[PDB]
Design an enzyme around this catalytic site. Sequence first.
Site, PDB file in Angstrom:
ATOM      1  N   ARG A 166       0.851  -1.165   0.000  1.00 45.34           N
ATOM      2  CA  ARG A 166       0.000   0.000   0.000  1.00 45.34           C
ATOM      3  C   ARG A 166       0.884   1.211   0.000  1.00 45.34           C
ATOM      4  O   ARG A 166       0.577   2.220  -0.619  1.00 45.34           O
ATOM      5  CB  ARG A 166      -1.024  -0.019   1.134  1.00 45.34           C
ATOM      6  CG  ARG A 166      -1.904  -1.251   1.007  1.00 45.34           C
ATOM      7  CD  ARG A 166      -2.605  -1.551   2.321  1.00 45.34           C
ATOM      8  NE  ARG A 166      -3.433  -0.442   2.798  1.00 45.34           N
ATOM      9  CZ  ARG A 166      -4.061  -0.506   3.966  1.00 45.34           C
ATOM     10  NH1 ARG A 166      -3.936  -1.591   4.726  1.00 45.34           N
ATOM     11  NH2 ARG A 166      -4.816   0.508   4.391  1.00 45.34           N
ATOM     12  N   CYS A 201      -0.542   6.904   8.532  1.00 47.66           N
ATOM     13  CA  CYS A 201      -0.810   5.558   7.986  1.00 47.66           C
ATOM     14  C   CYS A 201      -2.031   5.734   7.128  1.00 47.66           C
ATOM     15  O   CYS A 201      -1.992   6.681   6.363  1.00 47.66           O
ATOM     16  CB  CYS A 201      -1.001   4.449   9.053  1.00 47.66           C
ATOM     17  SG  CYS A 201      -2.314   5.010  10.155  1.00 47.66           S
ATOM     18  N   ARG A 202      -3.064   4.885   7.233  1.00 46.48           N
ATOM     19  CA  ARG A 202      -4.302   5.002   6.437  1.00 46.48           C
ATOM     20  C   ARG A 202      -5.301   5.982   7.044  1.00 46.48           C
ATOM     21  O   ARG A 202      -5.797   6.859   6.347  1.00 46.48           O
ATOM     22  CB  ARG A 202      -5.063   3.680   6.169  1.00 46.48           C
ATOM     23  CG  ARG A 202      -6.580   3.841   6.042  1.00 46.48           C
ATOM     24  CD  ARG A 202      -7.082   4.179   4.622  1.00 46.48           C
ATOM     25  NE  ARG A 202      -8.545   4.088   4.506  1.00 46.48           N
ATOM     26  CZ  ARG A 202      -9.093   3.171   3.723  1.00 46.48           C
ATOM     27  NH1 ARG A 202      -8.345   2.317   3.029  1.00 46.48           N
ATOM     28  NH2 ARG A 202     -10.405   3.102   3.652  1.00 46.48           N
ATOM     29  N   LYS A 203      -5.578   5.814   8.339  1.00 43.18           N
ATOM     30  CA  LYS A 203      -6.523   6.609   9.103  1.00 43.18           C
ATOM     31  C   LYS A 203      -6.065   6.991  10.509  1.00 43.18           C
ATOM     32  O   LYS A 203      -6.925   7.207  11.367  1.00 43.18           O
ATOM     33  CB  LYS A 203      -7.862   5.883   9.226  1.00 43.18           C
ATOM     34  CG  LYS A 203      -7.565   4.397   9.388  1.00 43.18           C
ATOM     35  CD  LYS A 203      -8.767   3.581   9.798  1.00 43.18           C
ATOM     36  CE  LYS A 203      -8.730   2.161   9.266  1.00 43.18           C
ATOM     37  NZ  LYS A 203     -10.079   1.656   8.951  1.00 43.18           N
ATOM     38  N   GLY A 204      -4.746   7.070  10.732  1.00 40.23           N
ATOM     39  CA  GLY A 204      -4.248   7.451  12.037  1.00 40.23           C
ATOM     40  C   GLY A 204      -4.367   6.392  13.122  1.00 40.23           C
ATOM     41  O   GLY A 204      -4.366   6.741  14.316  1.00 40.23           O
ATOM     42  N   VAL A 205      -4.471   5.123  12.711  1.00 39.68           N
ATOM     43  CA  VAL A 205      -4.591   4.022  13.671  1.00 39.68           C
ATOM     44  C   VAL A 205      -3.278   3.282  13.891  1.00 39.68           C
ATOM     45  O   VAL A 205      -2.660   3.439  14.941  1.00 39.68           O
ATOM     46  CB  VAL A 205      -5.738   3.057  13.408  1.00 39.68           C
ATOM     47  CG1 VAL A 205      -5.708   1.930  14.441  1.00 39.68           C
ATOM     48  CG2 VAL A 205      -7.064   3.797  13.490  1.00 39.68           C
ATOM     49  N   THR A 206      -2.833   2.498  12.908  1.00 42.82           N
ATOM     50  CA  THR A 206      -1.571   1.825  13.162  1.00 42.82           C
ATOM     51  C   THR A 206      -0.415   2.798  13.289  1.00 42.82           C
ATOM     52  O   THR A 206       0.655   2.364  13.681  1.00 42.82           O
ATOM     53  CB  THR A 206      -1.216   0.720  12.167  1.00 42.82           C
ATOM     54  OG1 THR A 206      -1.043   1.278  10.875  1.00 42.82           O
ATOM     55  CG2 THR A 206      -2.344  -0.293  12.194  1.00 42.82           C
ATOM     56  N   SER A 233      -4.290  11.428   8.043  1.00 47.93           N
ATOM     57  CA  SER A 233      -3.584  10.376   7.332  1.00 47.93           C
ATOM     58  C   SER A 233      -3.842  10.326   5.870  1.00 47.93           C
ATOM     59  O   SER A 233      -4.317  11.312   5.328  1.00 47.93           O
ATOM     60  CB  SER A 233      -3.811   9.003   7.937  1.00 47.93           C
ATOM     61  OG  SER A 233      -2.978   8.874   9.074  1.00 47.93           O
TER      62      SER A 233
END
EC number: 2.8.1.1
Length: 293
Positions: free
Chosen positions: A186, A247-252, A274
């Site tokens: 990704r 990252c994708r949405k501020g999670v990992t 993100s």
Amino acid sequence: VHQVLYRALVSTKWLAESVRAGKVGPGLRVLDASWYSPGTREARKEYLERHVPGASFFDIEECRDKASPYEVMLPSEAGFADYVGSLGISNDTHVVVYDGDDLGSFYAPRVWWMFRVFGHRTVSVLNGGFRNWLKEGHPVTSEPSRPEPAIFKATLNRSLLKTYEQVLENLESKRFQLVDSRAQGRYLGTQPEPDAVGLDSGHIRGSVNMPFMNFLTEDGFEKSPEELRAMFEAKKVDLTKPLIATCRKGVTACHIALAAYLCGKPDVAIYDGSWFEWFHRAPPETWVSQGKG
């Protein structure tokens, strides 16, 4: 016992014993913050069946800015306080968080970060997650938890957060290091971003990739400091310099901050918007992919 370092990681053993000692109540709250892609695992039902004794379910879908067009954005101070206060958590509470991910940890670091960004320094993650709690045979239960409500005072701590605008300037200043925690595919643009219509994969220019899973051992535990350190280093990320994780949405991205924290740097900031927000807001010249452009 303060941000002098607080204890960011807690063991299953430590937890089972506090449990046995009747330690859970106003001073020690346990939260399950599991979340899974729709149609895969059922986070909430899983929690209703088996949960560490006395734990509450923390729903990110509820605790976030429902009005934003982007994914999983922080709620406001008030929204947060309200939420946490109802789970019986106050400013004096030691908060323990875990998730049921098979990897050992996925969403838990996100909740750890949210407490911090709102000013609560007394929170940790269960090293090894539910996965290990189970594997070890510690007590699990389906009885309901109903903490008495508490009052929690939330104060946003701006330095641990970065907005679209701040990241865009950084593109020019280059004052902070930008590290992306998504899977390489990704990040590179070779694999697609999931669960999104018209969302391309790829990354912000100048970003460095540190796939989150690389910070956990096969068994699902956090790697050790010496190993964390060697990792940032092989990556060319200097812990003595500012750093923003996205990252994708501020999670990992939260995993990059936990690990940096364990290595002694508690000031990793998180780009909450993100990739999701970025792709929809910035000019396409600010990012790159190993395809279509």
